[PDB]
Amino acid sequence: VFNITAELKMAARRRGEDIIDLSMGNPDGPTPPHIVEKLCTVAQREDTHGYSTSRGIPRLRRAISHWYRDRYDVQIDPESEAIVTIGSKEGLAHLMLATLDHGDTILVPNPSYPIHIYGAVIAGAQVRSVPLVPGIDFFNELERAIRESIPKPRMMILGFPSNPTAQCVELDFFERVVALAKQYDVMVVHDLAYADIVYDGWKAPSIMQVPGAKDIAVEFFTLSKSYNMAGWRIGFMVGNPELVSALARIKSYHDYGTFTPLQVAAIAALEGDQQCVRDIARQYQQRRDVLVKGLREAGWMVENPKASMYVWAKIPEPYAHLGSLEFAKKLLQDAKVSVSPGIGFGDYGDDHVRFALIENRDRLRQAVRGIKAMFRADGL
């Protein structure tokens, strides 16, 4: 369905229209200079080679261990419990191949990030979606989902802060999941891509802070959003040492490691001064504030996200009959603002659209003006 709104947008650009594109999570801004300089400097050294070791260069797995200790007081063995990925999409897709085949089911929330589905369907797995929405007991539905699939699902894939809803959970959420996943012996994957994209002084919890999460869980983190990595993919997975090893084995038949100069560049991102991450977080918080306040002054009472790069907006009553896909087309044609239709994230999302905070503030104000002129011209 995102193909549909990608086409309409591109048609609008080719018509010459000035479209505020708030429909993708591609960071707009530049990569921090220390990171780019390392990459370039290391690539230019005659002794450098692109290929590296199966699990990542030891110094980088060390940096990831340190990142866990410092942020979460969590122990990750760099030798056995950490592995460098070529971004989390690669990482996940490969964990699924290693772990899933025809005859297996994974559980995903609805609405959620569709990448987690594709990988599993590509690996041969079936997907069972679990409602994650206001006024439904998630833990009842998750436990139903486990009990009422035969055979039980091998795995459940969660991601907080959430894409697309911006939902944040505290540590007692993770305790429940973990105790539940151990009870039925279902593996937990957790996607921590938005851990640094956090507003109002809040911190994102890792699942690896629960005692014995390592016995049942793995956790993916990507550098894309925290460090504005554009046209570069790198991250890691940690936790259960057998799952880390199964990802290592599958990867050795696919790649020669992550591009070495990018791995060295990741060391410079993860180590040392993290002001560039706080600035990126801050830049999103203020874009959030212009968007949310502006939509509200126009009479669209959108909810204020506590994290992620997304405002997950409930379709106003007077347009609710249209559906998300139809509404998002209207926003594009009438307001000259590209959004993602909520239905693209699962059927429980059809009453919403998602905005990504990827244009600057003036542009955002221009998006708000376009939406407000639409309301006015529709008689609202």
Angle at 95 between CA 346 and CA 98, to 5 degrees: 120
345 binds, among a second copy, ligand PLP, none (CB under 5 to 8 A by kind): none
| Partner from ligand PLP, a second copy, none contacting 88, C-beta within 5 to 8 A by type | ligand PLP
Question: Residue 281 interacts with ligand PLP (CB under 6 A)?
Answer: no
CB 260, CB 52: distance < 8 Å: yes
CA-based max dimension of the chain = 67
Residue 28: CB partners within 8 Å, gap ≥ 6?
Answer: 358, 359, 360
If contact means CB under 5 to 8 A according to the sort of partner, which of ligand PLP, a second copy, none does residue 191 touch?
ligand PLP
* Residue 216 in tokens: 């049942």
The residue (of 29 and 318) whose beta carbon lies closer to a second copy is 29
How far is 40 from 245, CA to CA, in rounded Å?
31
Is residue 235 a contact residue for ligand PLP (CB under 6 A)? yes
Which residues, in sequence order, are CB contacts of 305 under 8 Å at separation 6+? 166, 199, 288, 292, 311, 312
71 is in an annotated binding site: no
Residue 360 counted as an annotated binding residue: no
Decide whether 146 or 189 has the Cβ nearer to ligand PLP.
189
Residue type, 118: Y
Query: 9 labelled as ligand-binding?
Result: no
The annotation status of 110 as a binding-site residue, yes or no, is: no
State the Cα–Cα distance between residues 71 and 236, nearest whole angstrom: 16
56 is in an annotated binding site: no
The site string for ligand PLP over 186-215 (x = CB under 6 A, - otherwise) reads -----x-x----------------------
- Which listed residue (28, 127, 256, 326) binds ligand PLP by CB under 6 A? 256
Nearest distance, CB of residue 63 and a second copy, angstroms: 19
| 16 touches, from ligand PLP, a second copy, none (C-beta below 5 to 8 Å by class) | none
Helix axes 241-252, 88-99, angle to 10 degrees: 100
222 belongs to the binding site for ligand PLP (CB under 6 A): yes
DSSP notation for 193-241? TTTT-B-TT--PPPGGGSTTGGGTEEEEEESTTTTT--S---EEEEE-H
94 binds ligand PLP (CB under 6 A): no
If binding is defined by CB under 6 A, does position 233 make contact with ligand PLP?
yes
Number of shown-chain residues binding ligand PLP (CB under 6 A): 21
Determine whether the annotation assigns residue 99 to a binding site.
no
Residue type, 135: G
> Which string of x and - marks every residue 101-130 that binds ligand PLP (by CB under 6 A)?
------------x-----------------
User: What residues have CB less than 8 Å from 108, skipping those under 6 apart?
Assistant: 116, 117, 120, 127, 128, 129, 130, 156, 157
**C-alpha to C-alpha distance for 368 and 277, rounded to whole angstroms:** 27
**Site residues, ligand PLP (CB under 6 A):** 24-27, 51, 87-90, 113, 159, 163, 191, 193, 222, 224, 230-231, 233, 235, 256
Task: List the binding residues.
Answer: 25, 88-89, 163, 194, 222, 224-225, 233, 354
